[PDB]
Amino acid sequence: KVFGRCELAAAMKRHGLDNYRGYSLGNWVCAAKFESNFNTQATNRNTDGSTDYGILQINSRWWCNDGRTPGSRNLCNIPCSALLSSDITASVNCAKKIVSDGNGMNAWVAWRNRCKGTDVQAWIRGCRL
Protein backbone atom coordinates (compact mmCIF):
# COMPACT_ATOMS: atom_id res chain seq x y z
CA LYS A 1 0.00 0.00 0.00
CA VAL A 2 1.20 3.58 -0.64
CA PHE A 3 0.39 5.85 2.33
CA GLY A 4 -0.56 9.49 2.22
CA ARG A 5 1.57 11.81 4.36
CA CYS A 6 -1.12 12.68 6.95
CA GLU A 7 -2.49 9.15 6.88
CA LEU A 8 0.91 7.73 7.82
CA ALA A 9 1.43 10.39 10.47
CA ALA A 10 -1.90 9.46 12.07
CA ALA A 11 -1.08 5.75 12.01
CA MET A 12 2.40 6.34 13.48
CA LYS A 13 0.94 8.46 16.30
CA ARG A 14 -1.58 5.74 17.12
CA HIS A 15 1.39 3.36 17.40
CA GLY A 16 3.18 5.70 19.81
CA LEU A 17 6.07 7.03 17.72
CA ASP A 18 5.55 10.68 18.64
CA ASN A 19 8.40 11.66 20.95
CA TYR A 20 9.61 8.07 21.07
CA ARG A 21 13.12 8.36 22.52
CA GLY A 22 12.88 12.09 21.94
CA TYR A 23 12.16 11.98 18.18
CA SER A 24 9.06 13.94 17.15
CA LEU A 25 6.53 12.33 14.84
CA GLY A 26 7.77 14.37 11.91
CA ASN A 27 11.12 12.64 11.98
CA TRP A 28 9.42 9.29 11.45
CA VAL A 29 7.22 10.52 8.64
CA CYS A 30 10.23 12.17 6.95
CA ALA A 31 12.25 8.96 7.21
CA ALA A 32 9.47 6.85 5.69
CA LYS A 33 9.11 9.34 2.88
CA PHE A 34 12.75 9.10 1.84
CA GLU A 35 13.33 5.43 2.72
CA SER A 36 10.39 4.03 0.80
CA ASN A 37 8.25 6.83 -0.64
CA PHE A 38 5.61 5.60 1.86
CA ASN A 39 5.39 2.23 0.08
CA THR A 40 4.78 -0.67 2.46
CA GLN A 41 5.95 -3.23 -0.11
CA ALA A 42 9.25 -1.53 -0.91
CA THR A 43 12.18 -3.92 -1.03
CA ASN A 44 15.82 -3.22 -1.85
CA ARG A 45 17.98 -6.27 -2.50
CA ASN A 46 21.58 -5.44 -1.59
CA THR A 47 24.73 -7.01 -3.03
CA ASP A 48 25.85 -8.11 0.44
CA GLY A 49 23.17 -10.76 0.65
CA SER A 50 20.87 -8.62 2.81
CA THR A 51 17.53 -7.06 1.88
CA ASP A 52 15.78 -3.92 3.15
CA TYR A 53 12.08 -4.45 3.77
CA GLY A 54 9.04 -2.23 3.93
CA ILE A 55 8.12 1.34 4.67
CA LEU A 56 11.16 1.91 6.90
CA GLN A 57 13.52 -0.32 4.88
CA ILE A 58 14.59 -2.53 7.78
CA ASN A 59 17.62 -4.67 6.97
CA SER A 60 17.66 -8.43 7.17
CA ARG A 61 21.23 -8.84 8.46
CA TRP A 62 20.35 -7.43 11.86
CA TRP A 63 16.63 -7.07 12.38
CA CYS A 64 14.41 -9.67 10.75
CA ASN A 65 14.87 -13.21 9.38
CA ASP A 66 14.33 -13.84 5.66
CA GLY A 67 16.18 -17.16 5.60
CA ARG A 68 18.56 -15.88 2.92
CA THR A 69 20.95 -13.45 4.64
CA PRO A 70 24.39 -14.35 5.99
CA GLY A 71 25.08 -13.56 9.63
CA SER A 72 21.46 -12.69 10.43
CA ARG A 73 20.68 -11.69 14.02
CA ASN A 74 16.86 -11.36 13.87
CA LEU A 75 16.82 -8.89 16.78
CA CYS A 76 13.17 -7.93 16.20
CA ASN A 77 12.22 -11.62 16.33
CA ILE A 78 10.11 -11.48 13.14
CA PRO A 79 10.14 -12.85 9.64
CA CYS A 80 11.03 -10.11 7.18
CA SER A 81 7.74 -10.75 5.33
CA ALA A 82 5.84 -9.31 8.33
CA LEU A 83 7.45 -5.95 7.40
CA LEU A 84 5.76 -6.06 3.99
CA SER A 85 2.14 -5.67 5.05
CA SER A 86 -0.23 -2.73 4.69
CA ASP A 87 -0.51 -2.78 8.49
CA ILE A 88 2.54 -0.90 9.81
CA THR A 89 2.48 -2.49 13.21
CA ALA A 90 5.43 -4.86 12.72
CA SER A 91 7.66 -2.17 11.17
CA VAL A 92 6.86 0.28 13.96
CA ASN A 93 7.53 -2.29 16.70
CA CYS A 94 10.85 -3.19 15.07
CA ALA A 95 11.78 0.47 14.41
CA LYS A 96 11.39 1.13 18.14
CA LYS A 97 13.82 -1.69 18.89
CA ILE A 98 16.27 -0.31 16.36
CA VAL A 99 16.44 3.21 17.75
CA SER A 100 16.53 1.60 21.21
CA ASP A 101 19.02 -1.25 20.83
CA GLY A 102 21.18 0.90 18.56
CA ASN A 103 21.67 4.65 18.62
CA GLY A 104 19.05 7.01 17.28
CA MET A 105 17.60 7.72 13.87
CA ASN A 106 21.06 7.87 12.36
CA ALA A 107 20.41 4.14 11.75
CA TRP A 108 18.36 5.21 8.70
CA VAL A 109 20.57 6.59 5.90
CA ALA A 110 17.69 8.56 4.40
CA TRP A 111 16.95 10.24 7.77
CA ARG A 112 20.61 11.19 8.25
CA ASN A 113 20.86 12.74 4.79
CA ARG A 114 17.40 14.14 4.12
CA CYS A 115 15.71 14.85 7.45
CA LYS A 116 18.52 15.67 9.88
CA GLY A 117 18.83 19.47 10.13
CA THR A 118 15.49 20.14 8.41
CA ASP A 119 12.11 21.41 9.63
CA VAL A 120 10.64 17.97 10.20
CA GLN A 121 7.43 19.36 11.66
CA ALA A 122 6.47 20.32 8.11
CA TRP A 123 5.81 16.65 7.40
CA ILE A 124 2.85 16.74 9.76
CA ARG A 125 1.64 20.31 9.24
CA GLY A 126 -1.97 20.37 7.98
CA CYS A 127 -2.75 16.88 9.27
CA ARG A 128 -5.48 16.00 11.73
CA LEU A 129 -4.02 13.68 14.35
Which of 71, 39, 55 lies closest to 63, judged by CA?
Answer: 71
In the chain, at which residue ranges do the beta strands (DSSP E only) sit? 43-45, 51-53, 58-59
Phi-psi region of 117 (alpha: psi -120 to 50; beta: other; left: phi over 0): left
User: In Å, how far are 1, 50, 52 from 7, measured between CA atoms?
Assistant: 12, 30, 23
Residues 53-84 as b/e (b if ≥16 CB within 10 A, e otherwise) read bbbbbbbbbbbbbbeebeebebbbebbbebbb
Which listed residue (52, 66, 87, 119) is catalytic?
52
Task: Provide the annotated binding site.
Answer: 101
Classify domain 1-129 by CATH number: 1.10.530.10
Fill in the DSSP letter of residue 105: G
Determine the 3-state secondary structure of 75 from DSSP.
coil
Which listed residue (7, 18, 35, 66) is catalytic?
35
Q: How far apart are CA 32 and CA 75, in angstroms?
A: 21
Q: Does the active-site annotation cover 35? A: yes
Q: Does the active-site annotation cover 52? A: yes
Determine the 3-state secondary structure of 45 from DSSP.
strand
Q: Where are the domains of the chain?
A: 1-129
Task: Provide the annotated binding site for substrate.
Answer: 101
